[PDB]
Tab-separated table of C-alpha atoms in Angstrom:
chain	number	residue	atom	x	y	z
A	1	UNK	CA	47.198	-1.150	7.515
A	2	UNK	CA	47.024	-2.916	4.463
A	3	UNK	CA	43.678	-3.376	3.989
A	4	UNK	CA	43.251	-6.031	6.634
A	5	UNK	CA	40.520	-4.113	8.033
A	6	UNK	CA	38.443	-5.527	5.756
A	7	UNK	CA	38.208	-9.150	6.376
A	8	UNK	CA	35.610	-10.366	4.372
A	9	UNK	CA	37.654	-10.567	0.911
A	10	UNK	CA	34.576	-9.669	-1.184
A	11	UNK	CA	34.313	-6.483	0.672
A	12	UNK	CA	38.173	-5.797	0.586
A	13	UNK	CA	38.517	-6.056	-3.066
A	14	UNK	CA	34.964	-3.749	-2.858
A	15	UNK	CA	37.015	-1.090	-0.988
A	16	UNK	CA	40.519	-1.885	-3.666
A	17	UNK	CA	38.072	-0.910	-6.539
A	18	UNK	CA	36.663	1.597	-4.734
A	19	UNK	CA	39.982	3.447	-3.630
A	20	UNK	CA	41.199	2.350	-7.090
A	21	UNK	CA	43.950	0.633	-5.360
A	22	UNK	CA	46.295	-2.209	-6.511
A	23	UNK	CA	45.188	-4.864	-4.801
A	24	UNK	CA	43.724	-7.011	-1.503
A	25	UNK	CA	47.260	-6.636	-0.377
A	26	UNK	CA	47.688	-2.975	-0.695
A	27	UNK	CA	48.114	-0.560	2.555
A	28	UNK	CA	45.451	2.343	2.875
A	29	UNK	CA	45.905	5.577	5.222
A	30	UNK	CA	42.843	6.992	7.260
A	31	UNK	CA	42.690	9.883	5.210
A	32	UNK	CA	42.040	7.637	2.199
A	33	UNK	CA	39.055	5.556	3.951
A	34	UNK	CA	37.919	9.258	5.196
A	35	UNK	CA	37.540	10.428	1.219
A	36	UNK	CA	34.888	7.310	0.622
A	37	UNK	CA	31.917	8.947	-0.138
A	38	UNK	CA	29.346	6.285	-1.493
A	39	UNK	CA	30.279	2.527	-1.640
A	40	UNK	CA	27.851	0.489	-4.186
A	41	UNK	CA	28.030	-3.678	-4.268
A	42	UNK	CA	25.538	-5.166	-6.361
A	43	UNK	CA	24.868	-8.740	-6.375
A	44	UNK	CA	28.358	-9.445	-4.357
A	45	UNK	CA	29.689	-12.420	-2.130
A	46	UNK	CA	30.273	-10.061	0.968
A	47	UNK	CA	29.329	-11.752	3.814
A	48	UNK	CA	30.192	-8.808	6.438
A	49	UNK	CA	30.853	-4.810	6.537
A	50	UNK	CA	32.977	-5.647	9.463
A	51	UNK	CA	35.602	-3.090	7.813
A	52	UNK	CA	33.372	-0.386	7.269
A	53	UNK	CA	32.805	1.409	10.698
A	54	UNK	CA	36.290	3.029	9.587
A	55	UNK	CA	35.019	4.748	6.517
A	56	UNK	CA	33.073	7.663	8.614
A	57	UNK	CA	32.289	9.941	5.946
A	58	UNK	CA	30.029	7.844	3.327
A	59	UNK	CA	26.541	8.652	2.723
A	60	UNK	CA	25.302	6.669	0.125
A	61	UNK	CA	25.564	2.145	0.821
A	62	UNK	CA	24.066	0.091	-1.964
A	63	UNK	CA	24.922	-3.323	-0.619
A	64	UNK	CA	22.856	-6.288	-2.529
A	65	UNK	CA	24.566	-9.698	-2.591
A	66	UNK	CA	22.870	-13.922	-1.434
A	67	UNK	CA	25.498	-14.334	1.402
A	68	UNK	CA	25.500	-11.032	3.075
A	69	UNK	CA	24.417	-11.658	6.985
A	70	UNK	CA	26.701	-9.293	8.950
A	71	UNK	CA	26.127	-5.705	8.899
A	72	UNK	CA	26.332	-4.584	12.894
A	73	UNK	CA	28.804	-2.472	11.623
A	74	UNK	CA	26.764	-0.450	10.326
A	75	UNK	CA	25.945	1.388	13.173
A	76	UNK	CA	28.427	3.758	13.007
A	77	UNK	CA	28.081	5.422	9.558
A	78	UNK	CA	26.645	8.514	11.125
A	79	UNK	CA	26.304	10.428	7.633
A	80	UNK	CA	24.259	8.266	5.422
A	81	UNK	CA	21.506	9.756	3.498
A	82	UNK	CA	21.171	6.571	1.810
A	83	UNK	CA	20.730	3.168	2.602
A	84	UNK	CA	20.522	-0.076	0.331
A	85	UNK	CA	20.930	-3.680	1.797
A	86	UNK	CA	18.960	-5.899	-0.419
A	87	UNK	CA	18.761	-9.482	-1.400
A	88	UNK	CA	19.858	-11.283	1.490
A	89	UNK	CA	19.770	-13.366	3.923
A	90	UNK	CA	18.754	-11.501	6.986
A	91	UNK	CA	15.865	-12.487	8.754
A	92	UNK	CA	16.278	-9.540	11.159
A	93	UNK	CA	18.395	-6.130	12.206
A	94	UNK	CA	20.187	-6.034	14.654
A	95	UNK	CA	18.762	-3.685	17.602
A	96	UNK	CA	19.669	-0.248	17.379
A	97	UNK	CA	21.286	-1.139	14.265
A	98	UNK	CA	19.724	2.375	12.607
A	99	UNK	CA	20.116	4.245	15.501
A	100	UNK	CA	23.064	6.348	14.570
A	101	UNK	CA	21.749	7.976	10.932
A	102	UNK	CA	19.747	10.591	11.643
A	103	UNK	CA	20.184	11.927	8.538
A	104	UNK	CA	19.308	8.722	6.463
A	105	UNK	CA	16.544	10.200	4.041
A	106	UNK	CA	15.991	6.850	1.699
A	107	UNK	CA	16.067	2.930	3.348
A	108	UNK	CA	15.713	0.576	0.940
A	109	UNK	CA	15.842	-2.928	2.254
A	110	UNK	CA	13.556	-5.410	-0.058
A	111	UNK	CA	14.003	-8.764	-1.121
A	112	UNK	CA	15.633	-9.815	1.971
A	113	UNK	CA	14.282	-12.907	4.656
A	114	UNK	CA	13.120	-10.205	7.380
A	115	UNK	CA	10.079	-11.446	9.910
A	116	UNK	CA	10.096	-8.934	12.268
A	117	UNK	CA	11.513	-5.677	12.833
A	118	UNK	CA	13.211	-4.546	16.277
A	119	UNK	CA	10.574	-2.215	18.347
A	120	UNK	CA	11.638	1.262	18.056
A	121	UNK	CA	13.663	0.270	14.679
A	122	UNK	CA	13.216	3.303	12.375
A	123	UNK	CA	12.713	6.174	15.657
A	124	UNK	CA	16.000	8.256	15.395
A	125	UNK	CA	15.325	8.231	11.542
A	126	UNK	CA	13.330	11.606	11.356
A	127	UNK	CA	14.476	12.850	8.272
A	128	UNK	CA	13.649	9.612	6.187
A	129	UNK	CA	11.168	9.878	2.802
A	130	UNK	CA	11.176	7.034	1.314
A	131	UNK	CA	11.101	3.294	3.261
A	132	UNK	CA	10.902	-0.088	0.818
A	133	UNK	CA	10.305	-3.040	3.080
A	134	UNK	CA	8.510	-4.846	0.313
A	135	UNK	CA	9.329	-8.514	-0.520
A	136	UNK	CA	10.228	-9.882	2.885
A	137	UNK	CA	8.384	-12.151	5.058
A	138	UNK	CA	7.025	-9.719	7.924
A	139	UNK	CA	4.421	-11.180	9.469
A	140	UNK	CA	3.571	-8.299	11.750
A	141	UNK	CA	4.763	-4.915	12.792
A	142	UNK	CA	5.301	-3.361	16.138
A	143	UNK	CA	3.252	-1.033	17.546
A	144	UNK	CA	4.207	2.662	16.855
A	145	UNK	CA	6.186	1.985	14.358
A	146	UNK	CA	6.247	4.305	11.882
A	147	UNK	CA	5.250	7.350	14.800
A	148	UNK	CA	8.406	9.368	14.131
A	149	UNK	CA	8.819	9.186	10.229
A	150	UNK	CA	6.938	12.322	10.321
A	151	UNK	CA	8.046	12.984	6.517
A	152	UNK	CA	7.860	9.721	4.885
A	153	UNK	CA	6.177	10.360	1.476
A	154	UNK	CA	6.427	6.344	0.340
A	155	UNK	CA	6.158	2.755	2.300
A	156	UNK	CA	6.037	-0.210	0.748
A	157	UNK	CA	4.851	-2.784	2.995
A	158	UNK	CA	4.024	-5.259	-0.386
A	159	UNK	CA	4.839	-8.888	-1.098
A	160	UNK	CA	4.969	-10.127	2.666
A	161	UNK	CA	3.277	-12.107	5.044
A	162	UNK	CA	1.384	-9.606	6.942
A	163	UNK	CA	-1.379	-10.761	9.476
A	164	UNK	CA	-2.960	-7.811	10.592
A	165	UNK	CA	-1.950	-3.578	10.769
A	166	UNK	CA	-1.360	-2.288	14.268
A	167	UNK	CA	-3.965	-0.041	15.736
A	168	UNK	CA	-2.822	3.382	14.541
A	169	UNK	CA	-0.007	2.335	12.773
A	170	UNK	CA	0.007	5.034	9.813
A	171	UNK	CA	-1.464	8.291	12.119
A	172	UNK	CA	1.218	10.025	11.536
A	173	UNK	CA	2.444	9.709	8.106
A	174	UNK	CA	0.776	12.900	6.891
A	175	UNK	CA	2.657	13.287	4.183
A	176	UNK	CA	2.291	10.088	2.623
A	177	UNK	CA	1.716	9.832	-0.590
A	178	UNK	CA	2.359	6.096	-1.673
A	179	UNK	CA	1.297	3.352	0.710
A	180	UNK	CA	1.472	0.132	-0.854
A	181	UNK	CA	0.225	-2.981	1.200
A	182	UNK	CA	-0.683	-5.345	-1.539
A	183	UNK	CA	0.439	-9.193	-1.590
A	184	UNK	CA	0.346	-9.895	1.988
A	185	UNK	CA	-2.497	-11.800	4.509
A	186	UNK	CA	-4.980	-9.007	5.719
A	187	UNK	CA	-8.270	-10.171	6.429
A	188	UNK	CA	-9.275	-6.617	7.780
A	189	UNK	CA	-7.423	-3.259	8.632
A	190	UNK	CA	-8.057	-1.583	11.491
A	191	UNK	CA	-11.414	1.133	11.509
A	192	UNK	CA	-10.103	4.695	10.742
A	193	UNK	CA	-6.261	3.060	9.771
A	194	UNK	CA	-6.543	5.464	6.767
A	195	UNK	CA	-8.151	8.764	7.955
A	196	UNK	CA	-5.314	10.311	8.385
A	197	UNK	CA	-3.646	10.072	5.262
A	198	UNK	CA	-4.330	13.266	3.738
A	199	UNK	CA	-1.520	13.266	1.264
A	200	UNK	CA	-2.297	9.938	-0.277
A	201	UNK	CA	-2.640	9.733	-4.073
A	202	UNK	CA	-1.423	5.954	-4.535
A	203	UNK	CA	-2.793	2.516	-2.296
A	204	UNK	CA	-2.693	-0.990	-3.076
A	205	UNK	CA	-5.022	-3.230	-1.084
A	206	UNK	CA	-5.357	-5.855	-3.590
A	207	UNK	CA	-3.752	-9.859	-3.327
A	208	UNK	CA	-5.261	-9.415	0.724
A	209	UNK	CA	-8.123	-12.129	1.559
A	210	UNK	CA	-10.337	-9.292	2.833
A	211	UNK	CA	-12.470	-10.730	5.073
A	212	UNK	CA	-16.264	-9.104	4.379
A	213	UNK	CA	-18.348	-10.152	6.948
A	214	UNK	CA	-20.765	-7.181	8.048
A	215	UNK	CA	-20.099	-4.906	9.873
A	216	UNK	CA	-16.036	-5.586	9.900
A	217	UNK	CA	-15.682	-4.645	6.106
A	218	UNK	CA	-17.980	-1.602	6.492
A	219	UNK	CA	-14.629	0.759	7.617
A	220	UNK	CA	-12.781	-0.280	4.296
A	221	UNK	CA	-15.758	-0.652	2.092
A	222	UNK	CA	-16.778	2.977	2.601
A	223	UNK	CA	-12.731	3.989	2.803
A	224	UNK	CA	-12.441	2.812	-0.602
A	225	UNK	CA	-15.782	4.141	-2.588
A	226	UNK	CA	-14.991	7.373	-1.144
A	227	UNK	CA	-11.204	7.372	-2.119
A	228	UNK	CA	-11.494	5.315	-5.511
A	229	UNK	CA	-9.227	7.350	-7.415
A	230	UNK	CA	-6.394	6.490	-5.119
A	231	UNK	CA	-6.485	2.491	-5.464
A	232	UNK	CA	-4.558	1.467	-7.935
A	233	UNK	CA	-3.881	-1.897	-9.125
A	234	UNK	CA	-0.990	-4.481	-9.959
A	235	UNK	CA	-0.553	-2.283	-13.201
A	236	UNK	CA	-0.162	0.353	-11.431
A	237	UNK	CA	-3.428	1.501	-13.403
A	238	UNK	CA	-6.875	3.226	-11.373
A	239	UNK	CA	-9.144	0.172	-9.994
A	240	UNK	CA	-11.231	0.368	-7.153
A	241	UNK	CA	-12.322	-2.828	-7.454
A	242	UNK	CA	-8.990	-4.827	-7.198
A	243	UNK	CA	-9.772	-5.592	-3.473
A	244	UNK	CA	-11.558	-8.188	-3.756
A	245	UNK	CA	-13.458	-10.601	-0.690
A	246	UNK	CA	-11.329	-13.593	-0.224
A	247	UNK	CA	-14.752	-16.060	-0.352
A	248	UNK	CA	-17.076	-14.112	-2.761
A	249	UNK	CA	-14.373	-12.466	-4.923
A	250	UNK	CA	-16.847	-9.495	-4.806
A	251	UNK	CA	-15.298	-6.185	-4.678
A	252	UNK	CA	-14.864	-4.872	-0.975
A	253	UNK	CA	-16.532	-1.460	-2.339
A	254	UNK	CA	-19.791	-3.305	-3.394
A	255	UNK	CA	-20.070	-4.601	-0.023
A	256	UNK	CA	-23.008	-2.881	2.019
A	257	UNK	CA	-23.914	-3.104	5.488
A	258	UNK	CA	-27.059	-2.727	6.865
B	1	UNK	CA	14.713	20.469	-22.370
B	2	UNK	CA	18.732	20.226	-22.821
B	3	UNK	CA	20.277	22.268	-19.998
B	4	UNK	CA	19.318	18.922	-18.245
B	5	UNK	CA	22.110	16.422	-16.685
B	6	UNK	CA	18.955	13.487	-17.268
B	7	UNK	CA	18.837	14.372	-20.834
B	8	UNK	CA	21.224	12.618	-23.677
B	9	UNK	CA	19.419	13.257	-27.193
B	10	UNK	CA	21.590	11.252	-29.374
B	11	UNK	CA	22.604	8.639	-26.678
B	12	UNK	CA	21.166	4.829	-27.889
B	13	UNK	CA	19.140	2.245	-25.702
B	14	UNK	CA	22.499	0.068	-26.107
B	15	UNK	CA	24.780	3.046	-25.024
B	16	UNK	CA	21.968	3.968	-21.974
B	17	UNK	CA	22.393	0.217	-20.899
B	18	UNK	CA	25.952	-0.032	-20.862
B	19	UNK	CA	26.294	3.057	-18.780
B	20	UNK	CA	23.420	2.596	-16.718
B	21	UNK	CA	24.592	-0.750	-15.224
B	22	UNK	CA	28.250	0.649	-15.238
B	23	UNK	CA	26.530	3.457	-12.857
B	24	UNK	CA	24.690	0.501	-10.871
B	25	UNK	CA	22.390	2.930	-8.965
B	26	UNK	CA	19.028	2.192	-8.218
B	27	UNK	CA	16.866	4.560	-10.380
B	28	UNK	CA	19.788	5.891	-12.281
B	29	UNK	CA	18.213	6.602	-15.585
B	30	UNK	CA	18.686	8.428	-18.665
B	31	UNK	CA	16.337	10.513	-21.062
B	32	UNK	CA	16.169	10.223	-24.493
B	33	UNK	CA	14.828	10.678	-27.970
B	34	UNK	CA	13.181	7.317	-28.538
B	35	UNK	CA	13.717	5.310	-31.388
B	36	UNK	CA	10.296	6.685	-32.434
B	37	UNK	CA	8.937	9.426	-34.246
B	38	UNK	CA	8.768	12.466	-32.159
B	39	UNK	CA	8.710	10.374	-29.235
B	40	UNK	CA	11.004	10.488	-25.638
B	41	UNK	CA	11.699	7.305	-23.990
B	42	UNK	CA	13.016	7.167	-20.112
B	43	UNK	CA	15.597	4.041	-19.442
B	44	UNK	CA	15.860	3.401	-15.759
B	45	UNK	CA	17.895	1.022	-13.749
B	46	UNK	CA	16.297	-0.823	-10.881
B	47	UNK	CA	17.027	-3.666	-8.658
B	48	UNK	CA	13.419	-4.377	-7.413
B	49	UNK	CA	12.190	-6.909	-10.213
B	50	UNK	CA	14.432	-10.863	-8.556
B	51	UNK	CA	17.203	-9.818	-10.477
B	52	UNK	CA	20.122	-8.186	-8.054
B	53	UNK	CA	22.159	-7.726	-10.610
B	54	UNK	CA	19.386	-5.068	-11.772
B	55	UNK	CA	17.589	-4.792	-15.086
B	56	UNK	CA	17.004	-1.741	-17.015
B	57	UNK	CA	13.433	-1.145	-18.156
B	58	UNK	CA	12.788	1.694	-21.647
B	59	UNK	CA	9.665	3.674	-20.678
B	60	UNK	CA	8.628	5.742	-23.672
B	61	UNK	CA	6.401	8.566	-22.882
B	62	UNK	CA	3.048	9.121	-23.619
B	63	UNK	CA	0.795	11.779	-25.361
B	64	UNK	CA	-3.000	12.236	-24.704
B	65	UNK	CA	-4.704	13.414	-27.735
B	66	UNK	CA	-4.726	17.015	-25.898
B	67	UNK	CA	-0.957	17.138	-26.272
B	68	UNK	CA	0.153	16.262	-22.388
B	69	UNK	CA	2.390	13.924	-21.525
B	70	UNK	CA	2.425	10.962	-19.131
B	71	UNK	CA	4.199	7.664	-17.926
B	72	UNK	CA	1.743	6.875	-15.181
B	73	UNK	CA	-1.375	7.266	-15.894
B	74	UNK	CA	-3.459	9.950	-14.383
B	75	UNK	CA	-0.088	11.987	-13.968
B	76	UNK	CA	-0.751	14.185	-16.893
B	77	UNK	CA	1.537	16.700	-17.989
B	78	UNK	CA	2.417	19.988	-20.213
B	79	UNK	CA	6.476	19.307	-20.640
B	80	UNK	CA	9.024	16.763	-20.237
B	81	UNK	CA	10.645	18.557	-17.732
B	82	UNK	CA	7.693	18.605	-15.506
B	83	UNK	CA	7.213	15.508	-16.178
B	84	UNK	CA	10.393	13.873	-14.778
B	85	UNK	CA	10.530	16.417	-11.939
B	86	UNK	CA	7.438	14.802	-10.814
B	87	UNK	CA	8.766	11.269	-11.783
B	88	UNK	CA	11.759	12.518	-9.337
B	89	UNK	CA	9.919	12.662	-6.684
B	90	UNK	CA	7.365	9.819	-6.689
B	91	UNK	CA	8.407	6.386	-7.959
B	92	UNK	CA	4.603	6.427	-9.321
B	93	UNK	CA	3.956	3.035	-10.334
B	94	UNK	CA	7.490	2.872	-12.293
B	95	UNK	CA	10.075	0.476	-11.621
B	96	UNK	CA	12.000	2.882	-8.872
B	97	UNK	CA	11.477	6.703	-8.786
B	98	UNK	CA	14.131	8.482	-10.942
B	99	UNK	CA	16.593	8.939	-7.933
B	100	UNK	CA	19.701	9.253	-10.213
B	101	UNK	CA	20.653	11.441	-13.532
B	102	UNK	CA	23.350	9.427	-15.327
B	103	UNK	CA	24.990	10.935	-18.163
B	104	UNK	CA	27.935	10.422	-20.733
C-alpha cells in the first residue's frame, strides 16, 4: 500500500522522511514498516498515529505537536522502551492505552491538558524508571497508582493542579530518587507519605499552600527538618525552607507542635 | 576523557546546536571544551522549558576550590567522566538527564 495507512498527512510525510521515501504517494512493503526502529516528531501537525499499529518493531516514540489528540493506536507497539507524547491536547489516555509495553523503561508525557489518569494506568509497566507527568492539570491521582513501578528512580508530579496525595501513594517506590511535587495545590500530605522513600536524594514541596495548623503540619514539619538536605528548591539549589505556610509564609520546618 | 561517544573537543556551541536539534532527542547532548580557559561545558537538548520545538541550554562545569567538579550542586566529583555518568542517570536539577550521546 502506498502509504495510505497513514491517514493523517502530517504523520505520512513523518513515516516518507522516516523511510527516506519519495513521497506521500509512495508504496511501502511490511518489511520496510518492520525496519522502523524509533520515530521522532517534534512540534508536528499530526493529529493521529492511526498508521502506526503497523510499525511493530519501534522502541523509541517522541511525538510532541498542538493538534495531536488520537493516539489509541498506540496500544499495540509492544517493544517500546521509550515513550514521548508531549504538548498536546489530551486531557486523558485512553484506558488500557499502556497496557501492551511492558518493556517501556522512560514515559515522558508533560505539557499536555491531562486531569486524570485511567485507574490501573501505569500497572503492566514494571520495568519503567523514569515517569514525567509534570505540567498538566491533574487534579488528583488514583489510588494505588504508582504500586507496581517497583523501579521508578524519578516522578515528576510538578506544575499541576493537585488537591491532595492518595493514602500510600509512593510506598512502594523504593528506589526513588527524585520526587518532585512542587507547583501544585497541597494543603497537607498524607502522615508517613514519605517514610518509605529510602532512596530519595531530591524533593520539591515548595509553590504548595501548606496548610500549618497543629497537629496536621506536625508529619511534614518533622519529615522535612529531619531530611533537609533532600529539599531542594526552584533552583534546583539545597533549601529546607522553600515550603513555606500558605497564611504565615513561615517555613513548614519552623512549625512546632505542642 | 576521549574514548567517549559524549565527548567532541574541538566541536563549537554553534556546531553542538545545529546537530543537537538535527538529532531532536530529548537530552541528546554533547561535551565539550568550553569557550573558557581550562573549562568543559555540557550542551543539552530538552523539550521541557514551553518551547516544543526544544531549546538547547550550555552548562559549563564547575570546580570547587578542592579541584572536584560539579553541575548540580552537592553532586561533587573527581572526573568528568564520573561526572556525566552520574548526570546519565539522574536528570539532577538539569534541564533533562543526559539520555542521549550525540556526536559528529
Amino acid at each position: 500500500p502506498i502509504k495510505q495507512i497513514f491517514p493523517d498527512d502530517a504523520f505520512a510525510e513523518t513515516i516518507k522522511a522516516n523511510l527516506k521515501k519519495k513521497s506521500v504517494t509512495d508504496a511501502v512493503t511490511q518489511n520496510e514498516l518492520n525496519s522502523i526502529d524509533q520515530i521522532i516528531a517534534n512540534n508536528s501537525d499530526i493529529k493521529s498515529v492511526q498508521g502506526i499499529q503497523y510499525l511493530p518493531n519501534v522502541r523509541y516514540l517522541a511525538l510532541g505537536g498542538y493538534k495531536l489528540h488520537d493516539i489509541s493506536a498506540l496500544k499495540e507497539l509492544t517493544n517500546l522502551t521509550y515513550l514521548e507524547l508531549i504538548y498536546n491536547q489530551l486531557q486523558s489516555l485512553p484506558n488500557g492505552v499502556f497496557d501492551k509495553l511492558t518493556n517501556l523503561k522512560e514515559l515522558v508525557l508533560y505539557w499536555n491538558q491531562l486531569q486524570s489518569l485511567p485507574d490501573g494506568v501505569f500497572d503492566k509497566l514494571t520495568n519503567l524508571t523514569y515517569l514525567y507527568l509534570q505540567r498538566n492539570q491533574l487534579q488528583s491521582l488514583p489510588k494505588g497508582v504508582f504500586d507496581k513501578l517497583t523501579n521508578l528512580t524519578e516522578l515528576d508530579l510538578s506544575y499541576n493542579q493537585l488537591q491532595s496525595l492518595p493514602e500510600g501513594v509512593f510506598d512502594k517506590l523504593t528506589q526513588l530518587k527524585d520526587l518532585r511535587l512542587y507547583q501544585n495545590q497541597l494543603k497537607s500530605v498524607p502522615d508517613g507519605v514519605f517514610d518509605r522513600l529510602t532512596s530519595l536524594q531530591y524533593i520539591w514541596l515548595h509553590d504548595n499552600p501548606w496548610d500549618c495548623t497543629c497537629p496536621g503540619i506536625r508529619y511534614l514539619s518533622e519529615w522535612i527538618n529531619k531530611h533537609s538536605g533532600v529539599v531542594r528548591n526552584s533552583a534546583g539549589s539545597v533549601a529546607p525552607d522553600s515550603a513555606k505556610c500558605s497564611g504565615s509564609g513561615k517555613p513548614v520546618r519552623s512549625i512546632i507542635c505542642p | 576523557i576521549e574514548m567517549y561517544e559524549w565527548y567532541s573537543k574541538h566541536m563549537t556551541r554553534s556546531q553542538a546546536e545545529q546537530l543537537l536539534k538535527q538529532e531532536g532527542k530529548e537530552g541528546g547532548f554533547i561535551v565539550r571544551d568550553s569557550s573558557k580557559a581550562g573549562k568543559y561545558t555540557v550542551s543539552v537538548f530538552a523539550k521541557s522549558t514551553g518551547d516544543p520545538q526544544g531549546v538547547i541550554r550550555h552548562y559549563v562545569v564547575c570546580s570547587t576550590p578542592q579541584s572536584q567538579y560539579y553541575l548540580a550542586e552537592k553532586h561533587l566529583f573527581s572526573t568528568i567522566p564520573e561526572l556525566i555518568n552520574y548526570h546519565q542517570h539522574n536528570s539532577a536539577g538539569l534541564i533533562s538527564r543526559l539520555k542521549y550521546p550525540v556526536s559528529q
